[PDB]
């Protein structure tokens, strides 16, 4: 039941409550604040300090990318609607919807990328488009075109996703005002989804990689210290935390590591 | 009608894709391009005569249609409620003067809107005037009769 | 309890009752003796 | 229409029929015996 | 004013409360709200319950059916819109084309007719053809309509009308977005205020005569247990309490006994 | 806040309960509660009364006009539904059936506007139409639409609403036995909303104009008592005191004469 290390029962539920009211606030990146490390060492010096915060930093950021893993909201959801967008409006603008358009190009540059698409090629060529229908020529805004009362709140909103893409809002698209009609307002939701779909995975597979590198680098720190004493629970404790982890091998390992907190609180030195 | 209208930022876009038609692989543009005044031909009563028949329609038929429903017409009460009400759907909030109209109003209201029709009667129709019969060879003339 | 083609007064039965009295005072051409006012659809069988 | 019930079921929703004020239609045969010996052969009857 | 009996002034300002929200609370039924009842039971058990309990559920029903007709809403109101939807679309739809459903047009006049429990019936007939134009190759289908959450919604609303005739709402079915073309849609509209009216009258009527019914019953029984004493002001309590009472009369009536309160509080021993 | 600190704090919390519950007791009207008046009057006597009790009738008149418009009931509410009945159902009854009234149409819109002797005749040429409709055949009789025992009941609410147009009832006039039609209780509902309608209005220009008599009658009365001195204070009260009001500058004469409540205290000799 939540495992950790010898610390104080303030130090464990402030722990607890951040690892369970992760969701709600900005800037969910545990290396930029540094609130957390300062609970996670114990106490007393250097002395009785350095393998026993070793471990809990091991466990902290575990948990950490535990509680990540299991609380991603889906952003397929919003792939959907970028679908929905890309199929129903544009093609059908350039077939169903006559003048120009070639089909190979623009369907090929709608087609090409399904999966895995970072594209901001795909999104000026549309903005050119877009552009071309609107007003002036140049490409000064990469989202509402022809207008920016909105601008700096989708800048901020984008930034919010940044900060937290556990929690993310998409913003809405102005109904009774807008220069052209459902075909701007399809491009410029078109040009807004992809942009935070590719923002949020992004911010996802920065996290990941963050938390992953941390507890990589803990685990030889963890282990060279460990690795001298000939005991039998100590090199019982050697096997179990230097077992090798991935991102996806994790959980069943928290697990593991609860049951063998049953021990390994006993095993230090 | 379009070439009254301003402010739209793609009206040179929409005049283009006016002005170019197509008929059996013979192109042509229309010259009544973006109000050059060559020959425009500004057409501004038949654009008015329409607008007035568009304008004047509803109400019409809203004043004759309440009236004289006990009788078993059956038919164009039904219809008219439907076409109204579909398009304009919000009927008659406002309504102007709240339902204060001479029969002497409704006289001229018919009047005028019967008069802007017969009057729009040169492009109501095309005659037939020749009814080609065979073509020669390379399109250069053809023999046909002759109707109205 | 009118079950037969005779036997079935609506005389009697709507003066014993009040579900038939309100029932022949909305359509008085039921009161008569003479043919079938109607029975219960279940009692009404009158070709069989 | 036709329709048969059960004698347990009938006697105690008999008066139903007469609560509501549903008119039973008139049935071909006292139809039929409401004209007359020389009506009943004019082709103003409708059962012939 | 407010006679009821013996009662507190607590029960009296309680039966006060409840007659005055009648038509604010839910599920209005004198049955299902027993705690008028035991508001309405007089202090110091049987003895004086013997007689005072049956005048005084006796006041209770006459001022419920009094408040009843006081407080009945007018659906001709939704009838009118009935008439309105069934003459226009329906009869005129089946003689502008496809004339072969005059023998269900002489159906729904008699259905304009009102003989409402017998026209109710066969609107599944009357909507198979809606069934028809809503879906091609027609099929049987549910009797309630084509979207799923508004069918389940109108269900809701037919029973909070059924709990409470005195409130009701209607659901305004209509809708812009029409994948369902506009005379099925009326076709609708007539279905969902057909069975309102009817459950609405259903209920009423329903109710009216439960309360006449059991206004007649607590006369009988009253008049019995009076009827052994030959005072006069005990005869001239029968001879009052003995008149016979419709729906019409049960107003005067109620006049009738405040005035004879006056007296019939001191008749009683 | 509150002023008249002078007086008995009986007086005063006389007062403030009448301006508290004005809007609930009955016949609401400085003039019928002389008690009131009774209970403004000043201390050690006539001598005392000459010149206090018309500052003191003073502030009672502008707090009355005051808590009169802060008070005021909205009135668009029942015109709304005056309005709803006179839409619906006059345009159902003529332009749907039998068109003889286009002119009387045209007459009830036109008066509907603002016209109240014309709203008379219109309850003379819709009391024909009941009548019509009612009875089927043409006859007059006078000022009865139906229902004698609720024309006596009527008589009793127009009454209080003419008492007490703070706190009106609506009466609901319809009836659940259906002797005379859906129509015939639409045009009782219309005649009776509108006379209620026309009750209210002429009874608050009434207190209105009451109100304002009075204010002008005490400024005058106070003005020739206070011009007899020539001290500052008494000069200063009589420049604070001699400006003239209107219905929508009364709040802001109250502010004032409250905020220089102390100067004018001292200012009485």
Known sequence: SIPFAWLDRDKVQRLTNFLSNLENLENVDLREHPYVTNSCVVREGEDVDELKTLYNTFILWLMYHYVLSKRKPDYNAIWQDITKLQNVVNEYLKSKGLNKGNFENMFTNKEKFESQFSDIHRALLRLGNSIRWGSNVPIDTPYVNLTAEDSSEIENNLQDAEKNMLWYTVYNINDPWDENGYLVTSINKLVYLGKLFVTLNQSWSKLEKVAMSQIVTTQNHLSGHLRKNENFNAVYSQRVLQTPLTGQRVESFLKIITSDYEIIKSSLE | ???????????????????????????????????????????????????????????????????????????????????????????????????????????????????????????????????????????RMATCIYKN | IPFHRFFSDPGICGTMNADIQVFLNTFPHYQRNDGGFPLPPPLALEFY | KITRENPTRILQTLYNLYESRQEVPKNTNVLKNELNVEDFYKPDNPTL
Request: net charge negative; hydrophobic share 40%; charged share 25%.
């Open chain 2, 1 to 139: 009608l379009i070439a009254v209208h301003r402010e739209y930022n793609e009206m040179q876009t929409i005049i283009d894709e006016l002005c170019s038609i197509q008929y059996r692989d013979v192109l042509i543009k229309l010259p009544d391009i973006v109000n050059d005044k060559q020959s425009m031909y500004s057409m501004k009563t038949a654009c008015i005569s329409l607008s007035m028949i568009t304008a004047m329609a509803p109400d019409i038929v809203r004043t004759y249609i309440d009236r004289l429903t006990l009788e078993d017409h059956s038919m164009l009460l039904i219809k008219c409620q439907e076409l109204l009400s579909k398009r304009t759907t919000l009927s008659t909030q406002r309504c102007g003067q709240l339902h204060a109209t001479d029969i002497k109003d409704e006289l001229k209201k018919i009047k005028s809107v019967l008069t802007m029709i017969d009057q729009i009667n040169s492009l109501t129709n095309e005659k037939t005037y020749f009814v080609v019969c065979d073509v020669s060879a390379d399109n």
